[PDB]
Design a protein around this nucleic acid. Structure first.
Ligand SMILES: Cc1cn([C@H]2C[C@H](O)[C@@H](COP(=O)(O)OP(=O)(O)OP(=O)(O)O)O2)c(=O)[nH]c1=O
Ligand SMILES: [Mg+2]
Ligand SMILES: [Mg+2]
Length: 342
DNA sequence: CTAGGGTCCTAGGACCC
DNA sequence: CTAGGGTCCTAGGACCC
């Protein structure tokens, strides 16, 4: 045999950084997100805000109606990136088998670690404590024989705790595990399963695999596997970004093409900078645009293209604007690139 | 009264052999 | 008295943080 997988996850990541750097924000409801005037949402919130119901992805106006004392911060990305680089270097003291999933979390494979006598429990404990020292931030961790259980486990003694699932404990832990707790099983999937009388991993273990393949395709095989603790996904330390985009939601819907082009002119230098970091010569596989309309419908138009090119993005966006807008107002415009393969 | 990044999967149809 | 099957494009969506 069994692997030893750790998932490490920072507690309230953006709000914890802001609370550390400004202690007057410790005991008051705060969130990182865009204002109502800017038609924004909540990136995350601290625990004082959360007991009022403030959640990641909530429209900021709803957040303020739920928590009128909410203090709203714009977010300091360089502060968060600095912390994220530090925790990942901490991870590297313990193993090179590191798969970051976002700024604030990573799977570790410590199957063959000679740290703490190979105890994944003590390694996770030591990683959490080293992060508290040095960074003055708290993390939670999960320890399990496979990825998705380690990720579920990191949520169970959150914040500032951990939870271990041994191979012996997996069958009991699975029997009653709500399917919605499985990463990748979101609102729509969960509801379709519920409509089918499937709520827990116990329910799916009684199910015909062919039946699940019929109704769900590949996802049905994943659901069948995870429901009995099968998850052979290896921790991969060699993943690279495959795309780069820049996009903006305007405070007011635009209705004139010239406004669309003007926004593209503002977006293009930013996309160029970012593509330059990871690909100095700007060579790409595809590039294209995104529009989102006043009804929250959105469309993307992209095409094979060898090199980032502003004039081609504008011409593309003119086509999208002319052919797909349908007379609607546009609330967002975005630019997009997909990188080459090897 | 609904962000901005991204991952991955599926599907319809063009293209290739 | 005409190509199926594979691959490539491409748009859209579920989902993740
Ligand atoms: C979920 C989510 C997170 N984020 C950002 C803000 C978070 O600080 C960071 C990591 O998100 P999460 O790890 O999902 O949330 P969190 O760490 O803030 O809360 P928890 O302690 O329960 O794990 O990513 C968004 O911008 N939008 C989102 O929808
Ligand atoms: Mg977190
Ligand atoms: Mg996280």
């Amino acid at each position: 045999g069994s692997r030893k997988i750790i998932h490490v996850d920072m507690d309230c990541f953006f709000a914890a950084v802001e609370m550390r750097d400004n202690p007057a924000l410790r005991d008051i409801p705060i969130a990182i997100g865009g204002s109502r005037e800017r038609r924004g949402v909540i990136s995350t919130a601290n625990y004082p805000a959360r007991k009022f119901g403030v959640r990641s992805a909530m429209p900021t106006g709803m957040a303020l109606k739920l928590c009128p004392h909410l203090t709203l911060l714009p977010g300091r990305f360089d502060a968060y990136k600095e912390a994220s680089n530090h925790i990942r270097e901490i991870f590297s003291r313990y193993t090179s088998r590191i798969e970051p999933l976002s700024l604030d979390e990573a799977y570790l494979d410590v199957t063959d670690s000679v740290h703490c006598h190979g105890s994944a429990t003590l390694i996770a404990q030591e990683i959490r404590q080293t992060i508290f020292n040095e960074l003055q931030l708290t993390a939670s961790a999960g320890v399990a024989p496979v990825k998705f259980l380690a990720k579920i486990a990191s949520d169970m003694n959150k914040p500032n705790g951990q939870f271990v699932i041994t191979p012996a404990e997996v069958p009991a832990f699975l029997q009653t595990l709500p399917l919605a707790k499985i990463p990748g099983v979101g609102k729509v999937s969960a509801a379709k399963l519920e409509a089918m009388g499937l709520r827990t991993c116990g329910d799916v273990q009684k199910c015909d695999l062919v039946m699940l393949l019929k109704r769900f395709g590949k996802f049905g095989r994943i659901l069948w596997e995870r429901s009995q603790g099968i998850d052979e996904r290896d921790v991969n330390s060699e993943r690279l970004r495959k795309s780069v985009g820049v996009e903006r939601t305007m405070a007011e819907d635009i209705h004139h093409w010239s406004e669309c082009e003007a926004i593209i002119e503002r977006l293009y230098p930013e996309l160029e900078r970012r593509l330059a970091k990871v690909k100095p010569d700007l060579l790409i596989a595809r590039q294209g645009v995104k529009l989102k309309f006043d009804d929250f419908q959105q469309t993307t138009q992209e095409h094979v293209w060898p090199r980032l090119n502003k004039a081609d993005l504008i011409a593309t966006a003119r086509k999208t604007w002319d052919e797909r807008r349908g007379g609607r107002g546009v609330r967002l415009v975005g630019l997009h690139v997909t990188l080459l393969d090897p």
